Design a protein around this nucleic acid. Sequence first.
DNA 1: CTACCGATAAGCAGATCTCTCGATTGCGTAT
DNA 2: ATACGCCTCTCTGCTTATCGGTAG
RNA 3: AAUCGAGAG
Lengths: 128, 103, 730, 57, 280, 192, 57, 69, 124
Amino acid sequence: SIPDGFKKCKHLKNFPLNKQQQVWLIKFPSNVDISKLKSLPVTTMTIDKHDYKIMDDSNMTLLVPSESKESLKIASTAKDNAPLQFDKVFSVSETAKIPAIDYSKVRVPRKDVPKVEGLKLEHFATGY
Amino acid sequence: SEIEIESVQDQPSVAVGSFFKGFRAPSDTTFDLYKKDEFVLHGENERLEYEGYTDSSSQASNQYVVGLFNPEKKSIQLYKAPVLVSKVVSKSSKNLRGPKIKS
Amino acid sequence: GLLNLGVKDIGEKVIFDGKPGYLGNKLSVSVEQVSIAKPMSNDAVERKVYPSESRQRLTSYRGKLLLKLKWSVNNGEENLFEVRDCGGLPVMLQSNRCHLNKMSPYELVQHKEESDEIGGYFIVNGIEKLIRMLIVQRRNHPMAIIRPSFANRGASYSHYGIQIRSVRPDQTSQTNVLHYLNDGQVTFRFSWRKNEYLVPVVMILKALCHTSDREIFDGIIGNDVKDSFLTDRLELLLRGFKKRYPHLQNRTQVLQYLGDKFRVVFQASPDQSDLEVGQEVLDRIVLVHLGKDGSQDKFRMLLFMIRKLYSLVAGECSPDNPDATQHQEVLLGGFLYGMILKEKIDEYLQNIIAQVRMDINRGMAINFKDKRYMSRVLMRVNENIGSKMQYFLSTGNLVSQSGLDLQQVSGYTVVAEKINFYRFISHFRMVHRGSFFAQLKTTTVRKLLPESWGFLCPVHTPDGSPCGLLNHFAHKCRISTQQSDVSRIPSILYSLGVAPASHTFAAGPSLCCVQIDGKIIGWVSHEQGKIIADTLRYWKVEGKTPGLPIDLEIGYVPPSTRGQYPGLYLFGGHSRMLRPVRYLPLDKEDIVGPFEQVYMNIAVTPQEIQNNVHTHVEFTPTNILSILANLTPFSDFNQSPRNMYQCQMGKQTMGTPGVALCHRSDNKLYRLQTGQTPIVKANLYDDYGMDNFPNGFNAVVAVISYTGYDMDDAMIINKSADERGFGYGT
Amino acid sequence: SSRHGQKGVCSRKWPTIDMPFSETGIQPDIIINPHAFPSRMTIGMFVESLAGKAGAL
Amino acid sequence: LGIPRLREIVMTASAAIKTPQMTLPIWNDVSDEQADTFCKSISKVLLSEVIDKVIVTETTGAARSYVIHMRFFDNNEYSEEYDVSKEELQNVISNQFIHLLEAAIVKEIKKQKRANNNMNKVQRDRQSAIISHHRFITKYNFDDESGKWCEFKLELAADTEKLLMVNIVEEICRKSIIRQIPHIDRCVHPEPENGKRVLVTEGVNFQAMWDQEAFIDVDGITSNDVAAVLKTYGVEAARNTIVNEINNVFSRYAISVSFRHLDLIADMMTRQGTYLAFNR
Amino acid sequence: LRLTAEGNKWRTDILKTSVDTGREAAAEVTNLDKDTPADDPELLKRLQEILRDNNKSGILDAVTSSKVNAITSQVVSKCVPDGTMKKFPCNSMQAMALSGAKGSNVNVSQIMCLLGQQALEGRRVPVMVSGKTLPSFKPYETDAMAGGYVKGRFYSGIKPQEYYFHCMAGREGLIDTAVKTSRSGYLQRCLT
Amino acid sequence: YQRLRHMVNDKFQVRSTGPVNSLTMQPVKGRKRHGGIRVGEMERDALIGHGTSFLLQ
Amino acid sequence: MIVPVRCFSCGKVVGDKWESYLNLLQEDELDEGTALSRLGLKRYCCRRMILTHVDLIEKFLRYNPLEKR
Amino acid sequence: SVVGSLIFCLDCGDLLENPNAVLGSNVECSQCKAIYPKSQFSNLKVVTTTADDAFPSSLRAKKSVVKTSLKKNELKDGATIKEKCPQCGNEEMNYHTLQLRSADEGATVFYTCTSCGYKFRTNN
DNA sequence: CTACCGATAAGCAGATCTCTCGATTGCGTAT
DNA sequence: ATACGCCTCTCTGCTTATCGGTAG
RNA sequence: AAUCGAGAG
Ligand SMILES: [Zn+2]
Ligand SMILES: [Zn+2]
Ligand SMILES: [Zn+2]
């Protein structure tokens, strides 16, 4: 039951995997322009005047296309019939800067109840 | 330090599957990759079906990448390879039902 | 609206005649639109009717309830519509179904009502009525419970269990209780009709979505695969299910088993296949707050609940107190109206179907297209939905065929007495736990807890029988009546670092579970979860990011040894309790809720804001008290029982009810002749406009032992002052 | 009652001439026994009477 | 205390007092330390109260073996805390606990069908006796030299599906009793009241304290329960203990009731030679 | 209801000794070293165990209550009747507390010297699941005021937190009298 | 000062003779219907304890 | 409702001073204390009777059964 | 595959039957209908210890590091007042107030001597 | 050996001070 | 319109089932 | 006359 609106990829690009190259899985938010991704740390990078967190983090398998460019074969280089687990994995997450509290302004000593003004003798002895 | 980027590959080149823990597959399994960056995968064999699809709720915000990192260099071979959840059905008992209504 | 969502989700109830595998003809009646109007009178052309007339005639104040059926035949061959009025629906004053909806003070006075009238109450049979605000378990949150009655339910039942209350967009409630059995099996309990039902949890898990068993193992047990307690419990569960139901080898077989099991109680149609009726029970019972087409989300939620139950029974998490405000929310009173209206129209559809079935079983002159037949059958049922609602208001009895998750039948509407404006305004701020707890002997439910700081008034509570039960609202405590727009928060959370649920393969209280409205979003570490909660609060306070409304409730629960179950919980729904607070960074008003308060430091005044301990502060300490409990002068110098007795006796004075007394016909009305404003008063005396309804008189009071006629509690009144009108009333 | 839970029934309507009079000529309209306070402990009524006299002045 | 106690005494005349207690005078020569030793020797100790942890090592690879290694507190700790010896503990384990455990296991199965072993041949005869007398045991060895542990294999068959075998052990370990005087769960030595030395035990069993004449003045043994006193001491002693009990409630609330009233109440209650009550 | 300048000085000097009673009580209940800081991670760990376990919570709420009640008794004895600016027989409040006409030395001490620790049942004020006794107090607070030790007096009014604790205590009293009125007798009918 | 609504004209009642119950020939209930007040079980027990027997009868 | 004819405590006729108090408050920028002193109210028993009067009768009067609205 | 005491199918994830409950040398996946030898599953071990709150004992209380036991001697009930003792005359006489019989009735104080142990619960 | 008994386990019946006001008391069939 | 037929959380005792001990 | 609600001691 092929879904409507879905077109099979009749051809696919290659995947040049043969100290040999390691395979990394890296996440990005939508708020990152992956096109002009100039560089990535190993960590509080600045991208488009915006800061992101970078840290390190197997169920997920790798689907590398075979020599047909019509489907995917499971990656394996050590010949163990087991997926080639990523040699290192990194993650990218948003960060924000929380303002430090100005205790110098927010620690207000208590103001005493303000004395009324214009207070004079409203009571006098009888006959005065 | 920081790591350089060679070329982000926006065209579908790699895919990522998440079947379950400790999953291994026969050497004669292949998967059908459809596009609409959402994908809906399908792989078949004698007794099983690899019926899978992406989650549109998660993909519209997060985007993944698979990359090859040179040790002898300072460059990364980045690729746009999304992750698809996969439910492995069995041909043995996929079409096994019962009567419509009990009298 | 809520009513239209309810009539939508009600569904269609069908009947057959069998008249020639031809099951017969199909008639699927349903209502798709409900409309109300401000009441009018035929005194030809309708003239607006104002509540002054209803009050003066000693009658009710009700509009017209419009119901359009859908007399559809055989999957839409021919569609018949009929807009049928269903009696008079009482409406509350100062609501959009009332003529006083936006009248200025001048217009209100012109139309004989009041200068600063507040509605919120109904007029039925010339007696004013109001719908109390019950307090119920927090919606869409699974809370671990230890209860002796759970084990008393039968053999092998234990105290442990997880109870969740899920709420539909209709604002109707469904309870899903995950019991625990000492052998190893988990028993999902629910209740469709007045009777209850028990289902093995793996059966419902598999009916939800096509899953393996290794996926259940991974979803209940995370990377904690060395925890023998968990491995053995889950192995017992899985093997017990695989034993008792060996033939149910796929989702369809499980669903057909459920549909076979649930036929007569669910009133399933003879047309409906067992598979689709099983999907119907699954989507009409299990975790209704995710709605239909959310099976993957329901599956993740049930795995979360199961792992939480095993955490509870291993003693790795503390029980959740069901009678603490940290885990509560309030039934507004209009939502009770909506739910009861949905129930009444459901019974109305059932009544018309019963009439057509009686026509089937007595004669045969029946035809679905026969409009004469449709008119003759509709006009032989009782379409007094509005009169049923008037009965509900005037009696307080919840005549229900099924009964909602409410634990009580009676005690829902009380008269709004007009002895005194303190009393009148107090009716609209009181919360009752329920008559169930009214007749009980557990004192601890009547306590005062540090979880009600700013939400329930510590002072305002009657003594006597209702002490601790009937406790009022803090005057700055707001109840949300609209759903916050959370459409974008999942998108923000993923950017923040909340790794998506669907492809993360993790569980357990060793990581934070990010959830929104009882719907798992993702999984993240505890340090990063604390950072995410901080960032959410910051971006919510600075209203720049358009994904975070101010009403968002960021409940972060850090990892605590045998404490509450950890995880980051976000809320946006109806019936929450909210109160303002000053977020120290950016120094602007924040909104907090009882769930998230108990884990954050909120300095009471700015003078004792400590370093690196506090992030919030009250605007003022006086907003933790009710209106009555705030109008008492120098109440921090009195002893607390004396403040409580003042809160009680301020509602019993002979003050002034109102000024429009020439246009009312109340049974008994106490009025003070000459009131005065107090010389010494709280600031909030003026803000709530109490000077429109003076309650007492300033008097010169001598603290003297002179008379001998005032020793225990008596007091002496000057005779001359009494002859001069001191304390006079009619 | 006052606004401090100091209820009590009117025992007798004392004649004005029999009421104690002050140096300013005023006779209180309410007499409250001093023994109401030591057990109830409503010091708020004391400070309120103080402030009410000052405000009326 | 209070109205619950007066309901028990006057409105119910329950034989089963909610909290039975015994007052046991001590001879004026028995020292306080010896009195505490007597308390330890009289008070009940369960097998649970001496076990630190129990490690159950299942191994289904067709006999489902169920090796159990129950760890004990250090002997210098638990002997001094409970007056329990290694030999007494070993006898309790070998006799009572294993039979209780296997009874629980067979009940569960019936419901379910719906450091070193360098033996000295004494331990070997003991193991053979345990194996013969027991329905599942196959291994057994006790730390006779140090009194710190006990391990035994409870071998089973593959017919049976999974057992918890840890909750079972916990429940049985709570059930089993090392030593116990009937009806007594604890003997606590409070401070003297009115200068008289008294031991108070948590259950009433008169005929069991008569053995320890050297410690307890059995002439002065009076107890909280009235039915027990009426059984073993007659009507008049029951009337006296009724009066003392109904006077103890008011005294602890510093409420004085004339002893004539309590005496009349007691005489009406015991007018038939029995412990009547004020009810239907 | 007033004191002298030196009476208020005595009161404040003795109450300044109540800045460490709660912390020392906690430091000895957790079997820790004395003079241990109130932010010690080991102290917080042991305090969390005390919070989890009801019996250990009772031990803490008894020891701390003992020490703070000792401080209260010191204040009362030192400042009455030697601190009042008006003295018996002139002082009418003290006069009717002494004569038994109405009131007690407890009430007089509460109006003039100290309100003292509020006890709910036998323990101090309830503690939330987070280790917080109130939103205003940080988790696992070794402060007497946090645990319900009201150092204010009805003459000079009590702080918002102490007001909340005092409301807890008053509500407890009214709940107790509610229970008494509900289940009262029938013992007298059965006897008579 | 606030005037509470529990005035004493709604509290006092006196009956010498008047309407009686149907089958018992005893005073009716209720202040507003001219009925007598009840001498209950505890009043009877207290009236016996005085030794007042003609009074109790 | 409306200004009392006499002071409750002493009996000094304060019923003829409400309009004058209002005028002294509105036209002149007098304080309430200054206005009451200039009105002839010396005892605070008499001062309170005009200082604290609310005059609810004006609000009562807007509901007139005998005039079309 | 096999995890502790459980075996899951490698190809569909269904829970395999316990080997010692079926025939020799081969077990069958119910879903995949595959074959798994009874080799490579030599032992299904699960080592479980007790709850560490299972056995509440006086030694388990003393096993902890916090203070668990409160002596009668070490409890000084506090609340010392200078009331006069009706028995002996020692100055100390502890107290406690408990409102009774109404929300308005007078208070009562449980006066208790410290020397002779005399008790006095007097309202006024 | 055999009644014959019996120690459990299980089912079942009843209470839990005086006073004053108001508001409301139900619904399906068939001549 | 109007007369017939009808619908979820205590706590003492006294009294009985049930599948096995128990003297002759 | 039963219940429901409100209250007084
Ligand atoms: Zn005057
Ligand atoms: Zn398989
Ligand atoms: Zn003494």
